[PDB]
Amino acid sequence: TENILRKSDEEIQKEITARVKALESMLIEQGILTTSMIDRMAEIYENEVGPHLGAKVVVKAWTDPEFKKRLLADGTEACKELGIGGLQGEDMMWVENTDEVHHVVVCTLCSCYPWPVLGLPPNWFKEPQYRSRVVREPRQLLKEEFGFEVPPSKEIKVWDSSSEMRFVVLPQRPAGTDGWSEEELATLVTRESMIGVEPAKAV
Amino acid sequence: TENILRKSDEEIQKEITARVKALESMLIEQGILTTSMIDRMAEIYENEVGPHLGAKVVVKAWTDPEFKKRLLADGTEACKELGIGGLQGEDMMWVENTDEVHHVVVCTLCSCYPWPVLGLPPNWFKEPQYRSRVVREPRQLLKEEFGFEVPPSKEIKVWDSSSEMRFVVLPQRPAGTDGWSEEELATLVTRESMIGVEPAKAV
Amino acid sequence: MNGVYDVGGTDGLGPINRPADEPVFRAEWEKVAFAMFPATFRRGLDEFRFGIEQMNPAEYLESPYYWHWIRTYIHHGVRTGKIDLEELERRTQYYRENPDAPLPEHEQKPELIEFVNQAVYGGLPASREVDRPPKFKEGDVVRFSTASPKGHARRARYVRGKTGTVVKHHGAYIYPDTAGNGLGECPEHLYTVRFTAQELWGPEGDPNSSVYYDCWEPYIELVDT
Amino acid sequence: MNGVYDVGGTDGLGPINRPADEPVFRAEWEKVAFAMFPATFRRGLDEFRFGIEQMNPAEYLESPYYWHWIRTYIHHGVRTGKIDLEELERRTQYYRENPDAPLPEHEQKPELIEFVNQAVYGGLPASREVDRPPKFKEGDVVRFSTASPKGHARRARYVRGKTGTVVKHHGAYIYPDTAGNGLGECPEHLYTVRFTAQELWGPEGDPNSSVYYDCWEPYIELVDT
Ligand SMILES: [Co+2]
Ligand SMILES: [Co+2]
């Protein structure tokens, strides 16, 4: 939004870069940061951990009703059955989209997100526009920002992660996918479908 | 406070000046602003209306107990007895400092101030630091910002002007001023003493 | 609306910046912004507030105060179509580049001066006479509404749902929840209510302090007379 | 604390800015800020949050997200004296002027890599075993405290004093009101509570919506089982 007091993006980027390199040079001299530790972290959430992991959990719960029941009883344990877990997903509770109930997830206090199944959150999730409005106008927010009309009779449940418990949406299986393979069904599970801001892809 | 995104004060001033002259040139062409109307307003609150007016009300209530009772019953009517009133002081309620009670005044929603007795408010009154903290830590705010220790047994009453009613503090008469003239006592009444952030001057 | 502008009880805004003295007007542009308050209501005061409340909050929190007045005027201008926003940008750049360029030629208007002196010394009273008598009276114990309108209102978040004691009935006044939203005056009875610090903040409140907050009749409901 | 960072239910922040795609890291500096989360707790996660919450709000609301992490690290560094603030300013200007200058020579450390892989795939669980049993159970109707600590807590203003229904007991976890204020873990039982939109916002709330908010035991008191 327009703010006449604000520097240009380019000027902001240039100032942040210098402040960060300066702090980094001090942490390195203290021995608590190294270039290799930085690259390993970047490498992990750029290539290893990401929403493709959460899609596997979704297609398994879609095609395996016993697993789905365990997913909904205890999300951390069930995702572990697929070797999926760890940092910022130590406590995971998955919640099921139905014909009667739609779920959407948010961290109004900061940016809490289930990193082991989704990776790091997109910037709109961590920013004040989504966080402030979704607990208060979920139905319009979904219509206006995501093109997603949730009928006024359907209940919208908003999960605000004020604790280390992380909420992940299990989206409804799209119609027209009977008997599809797990890899086929995965192409329909989006990051957005597991935040609850979109359904899984149609067709 | 430090904000790395913020332009320099000089750059902010230069940008505001241009935006204001631009808006002004448009309002003038619409005929709703003129240079003479601007100068008259500036002239009034630079030279005519100011806290010297409120000091007269204070010294009268100090030296006239019947007037003081009318001041506290209906502030607008009593100030009118001195030909003092008008814009942003249509409804005035004055409140009395005692040995048991100290009063402080604030507009947390914006900047409401009793213009006819005080003039326009200082910038710290209209800014978020004072407005946010005074309803919540009045005692420390008075100590830290104004050097004013209000003993923890004394009750601090904070008046938040959420309506057109304007609150004005009647400060306690300083000790050691028995029989002083009205002009002498006026030198002790400050703008700050009628906001409640300071007592009237000592000695 | 639940704007950040509603700063009562917000933590972490920092120490007060108070110079020892300052002038009424720190720059000539501030006089122009000021003169626009009286030029505005000549939309009322409530709508004028609502437009400041819809500012960019980061802009609101750090800009010079009278910039808020410039913003609220532009807000209503473009909405009522009286200010063409594109012409205004062109004029801004023009004056960016030629800051000493003259203003447009205009006739001085005597009636604008008489209006100014009239409003300043005569006032613009918001008190109104209504047909219903007051619902509440001194010493009634009342509860501030937990409603949260999306438009303009005077319901500071830090009192919503709190319980206080009615301290004074003032008569009836312009009602902000209609006036500042373009829905008319719809006058309502006005009361000062007293809230203890401990009711407002919990144990973190000063044990010997209270806050007086003005409530319009629809804001409060009886708990005990 | 009552920081502006607690944005749930705030009005007027504007439309969402969402590009169609974006990379995980938009600039190399963001990777450096990110790597500082794991370098921090090697102070816990709660204290890390508290330092972001004490930022300048206008800075907080508009800066790139990972700038918040840089701020919270500097906050704790100067406080614990581990970051000399004057050296840091000199280094900033140095890198302002020589942005391609090398970093200081250092030994790579194998144990920092093993720590990283350990934290990432093994996790850093906040669940703890406590000696007292839970006070509350599914279907209990509870009221969220109206307390307002000045330090760190997880009491979003928009639920304080609201009434909800306990939905699930999770066990006990690190308690933020002690942990994020340097007062230890002091583990407490954790519950998900359900609040209707209408309890939260009044008539302005969606008539078919509810918000689930996690509450630690001291946050809530019984109204009805
Ligand atoms: Co978060
Ligand atoms: Co005000």
From TrEMBL, chains A, B:
Entry's Gene Ontology molecular function annotations: nitrile hydratase activity; transition metal ion binding
Record bears the keyword DNA-binding: no
EC annotation from Swiss-Prot or TrEMBL: 4.2.1.84
Stretches assigned to the Nitrile hydratase alpha/Thiocyanate hydrolase gamma domain: 15-197
Positions annotated to bind Fe(3+): 107, 110-112
SUPFAM superfamilies in alphabetical order: Nitrile hydratase alpha chain
Pfam families per record: NHase_alpha
Keywords on record: Iron, Lyase, Metal-binding
Catalytic activity: an aliphatic primary amide = an aliphatic nitrile + H2O
Family named by the database record: Belongs to the nitrile hydratase subunit alpha family.
Protein name per its UniProtKB record: nitrile hydratase
Species whose genome carries this gene: Pseudonocardia thermophila
